[PDB]
Amino acid sequence: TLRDEINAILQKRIMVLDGGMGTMIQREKLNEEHFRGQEFKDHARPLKGNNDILSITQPDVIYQIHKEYLLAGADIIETNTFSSTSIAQADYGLEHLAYRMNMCSAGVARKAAEEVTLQTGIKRFVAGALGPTNKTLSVSPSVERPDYRNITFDELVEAYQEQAKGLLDGGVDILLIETIFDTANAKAALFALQNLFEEKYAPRPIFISGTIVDKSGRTLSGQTGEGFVISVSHGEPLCIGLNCALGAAEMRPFIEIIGKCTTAYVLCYPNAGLPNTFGDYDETPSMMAKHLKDFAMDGLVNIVGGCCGSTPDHIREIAEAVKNCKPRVPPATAFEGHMLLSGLEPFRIGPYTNFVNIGERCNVAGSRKFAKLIMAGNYEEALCVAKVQVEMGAQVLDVNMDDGMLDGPSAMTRFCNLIASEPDIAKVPLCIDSSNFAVIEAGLKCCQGKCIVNSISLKEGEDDFLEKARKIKKYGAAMVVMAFDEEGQATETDTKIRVCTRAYHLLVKKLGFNPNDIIFDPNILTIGTGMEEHNLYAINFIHATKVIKETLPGARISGGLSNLSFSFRGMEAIREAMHGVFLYHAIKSGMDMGIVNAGNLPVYDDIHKELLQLCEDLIWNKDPEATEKLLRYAQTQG
Ligand SMILES: CN1c2c(O)nc(N)nc2NC[C@@H]1CNc1ccc(C(=O)N[C@@H](CCC(=O)O)C(=O)O)cc1
């Protein structure tokens, strides 16, 4: 296929990609009438600056620019489709022409590429450019309305699907998602491409490139380079990297950081310097070539090019500068064995990582204050619960909106839109928790980075479990599997182990799920209720954790720690002691994380030895009188 050829080429030499088409068009200096051409002379809206209309109104200009860039030593050419989406063309009243526009852009690029290939023999590739669109999905249009978004995930998916249909019909060699101001739009584009690649179309190599705004190392949406790489890696892009907004000097540390994270190839095409007082990117090709040669000699990049200001002369010098340099060797084992999550910043859970706290208080069912604020519609104050949880050591936030008095998906969407408006709350990943999959999907469609999906199980059969897991894998998030199957909840140790193994071997084999993104939950259940059957639950959970961690490679273990101490509600000291004692054994067992009250967990040495011993008898069933002995001890505190 085409991906095999591109991979073979990238393993031997550095590939040169396009340049400043948007500036070469300004060098033509077309007026209003050239934009209209023959067909759009009757159009009632001005097409000034619509660089994508030239694929039909002035095809010769675009073809000649492609030819000049191609003879300037370039190897990959972007199609003239930066704003050819139905949303970007809305400012010009050409919503209905996106498919035709993309077909004609692909054709006019393909003719030039084929002619140059016939001239030189060196095969040239055409990359379909998917624009970021002026609409942002993670950034509110207005500061006063943080939860408001003027575009949704489904609309963006539909528009990008419409664009990529025309691109694929035209026969583009590569699909390129570039100048990403918001990685959520990149995820939507990947979603549309994944729909297309299974509905009719054969797969294509996928190129992704972000845009770092300034020296902060963060995109316009606030996410850093590692977070971006983690967020968009679920689509398995052949190449990732940066472009624009920074020269070849300021971009080097971020390219280093990104190349240290991804196992895919690194593509870098920056600006041609900085804007002068006259508005021109005046860095001569001599400095650009030497800077890209410095990038290549160190082994930072595998594809080089140029952003705005890169005339074909810049590409002509660069293709000679990087002619002899060896390609970058990717870190084929980059963070092997780790679990990669992301918010505005990367989050990693490796073999040596300590116990990971997941905040429980962002739960309508489980939290009193959060539920009281949510039913009142005061999400503005409800964000403070997540803020305080993060301030108290919670590394992931668990969001649950399941209630019969609330519209699930709408509340979940509003809260996930409000979360992204605050940086420190948004830098930690989210755990999307709901018994309804329509709420999990709504939560995933709003998240910027890579999140965790909670409460999926084998309850409704193997087929439904596989369908849900396939949808989640397409969404690219983490997944918590409950110990629940067709026969009911798993209470015994062997039942938990059987259910978890059956879930694991379906995901890994039938679906090809990533083994490091599976988080089994052996269903921590309440003890101390005074019922005989409610005594062994901690023991079965611990033994099942041991057995699962010792036999399922990569799979993590979590649990609802607060569920264990339901019988002692109101006696918060005993609840904290029980949580600490249970954690001391679960972490030793292999419990990687859990939905825990992050700020209310004590160290195993602090707990009073009498209370610690009583919790030990109750948890480990060392004494049938422990459940009453604990209450008897509690009554002494009055
Ligand atoms: C059901 N359980 C659970 C689970 O067992 N497994 C998974 N994967 N996920 C989850 N998520 C929900 C739940 C764990 N979350 C909880 C569990 C218990 C509580 C709780 O007891 N809250 C106290 C109030 C505490 C407060 O007001 O802050 C109460 O009296 O209800 C609060 C949150």
Numbering used by the authors: 17 to 654
What is the paper's account of this structure, in its own sentences?
To overcome this, we screened and collected data in the presence of MeTHF, reasoning that it would stabilise MTR^FL^ as found in our thermal shift experiments. Initial screening resulted in separate 2D classes of both halves of MTR. Despite multiple processing strategies no classes showed the concurrent presence of both halves of MTR. A larger dataset was then collected which allowed us to determine a 3.1 Å resolution structure of the 70 kDa N-half bound to MeTHF and a 2.8 Å resolution structure of the 68 kDa apo C-half ([Fig fig1], Supplementary Fig. 3, 9, 10). The N-half structure of MTR^FL^ confirmed that the Hcy and Fol domains are TIM barrel folds with the short Linker 1 (Pro347 to Phe371) that tightly locks the domains side by side ([Fig fig1]). This arrangement implies that large conformational changes are required for the Cob domain to interact with the N-half domains during catalysis as has been suggested for bacterial MetH. On the other hand, the Fol domain showed clear density for the MeTHF ligand ([Fig fig1]) making interactions with the conserved residues Asn470, Asp537, and Asn579 through its pterin ring containing the methyl group. Additionally, the p-aminobenzoic acid (PABA) side chain of MeTHF forms hydrogen bonds with the residues Arg384, Arg585, and Arg591 ([Fig fig1]).
